[PDB]
Amino acid sequence: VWSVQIVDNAGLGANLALYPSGNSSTVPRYVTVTGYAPITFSEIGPKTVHQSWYITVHNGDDRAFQLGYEGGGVATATFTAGGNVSISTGFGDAQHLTLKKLA
Amino acid sequence: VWSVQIVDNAGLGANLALYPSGNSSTVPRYVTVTGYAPITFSEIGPKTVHQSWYITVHNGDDRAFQLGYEGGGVATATFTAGGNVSISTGFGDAQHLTLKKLA
Hints:
Two copies of one chain form a homodimer.
Chain A: E1 2-9, E2 16-19, E3 29-33, E4 39-42, E5 53-59, E6 62-69, E7 73-80, E8 84-88, E9 95-98
């Protein structure tokens, strides 16, 4: 099971939120930023990472990458200006994406 | 200002959710269905509808359509088999989208 932590270094404030928040679970989690497509975290397979456990990340519609973890997972998404997001679990390298504007 | 209400006629149960709440405001609303791209409701312009006020709907990262309303808006999304969603404000015609699986 895994949680999602959000670090706002982008001055996003109340524009940035996790739903549902506060859980370490298997269920999908959604990081939302007003004006952009939600980033979905979920257990959509198959496992491609080398670690025991995984979290798949979708940037809007599209599969962005997969994260791996051991023990109780914590995927931390760090936001910086320009829609930059760095996502890391502490296993393997952090991975970057950019928020997609809703048109 | 406007609210979103969801109606489960698809036996989704705990797999269907609305965020942040069913209350009225101008911020984005998000509807999630386990395993599918989330639906976003928000004021992404320009206004294409004939009504004074609008709510734009995105199916994942794609623009699905725009709803119009007068007075205090209520966008009601009704879910049926096959990930079929009918969305209406009671102004103009109801519009339809189909949920997309996250791959």
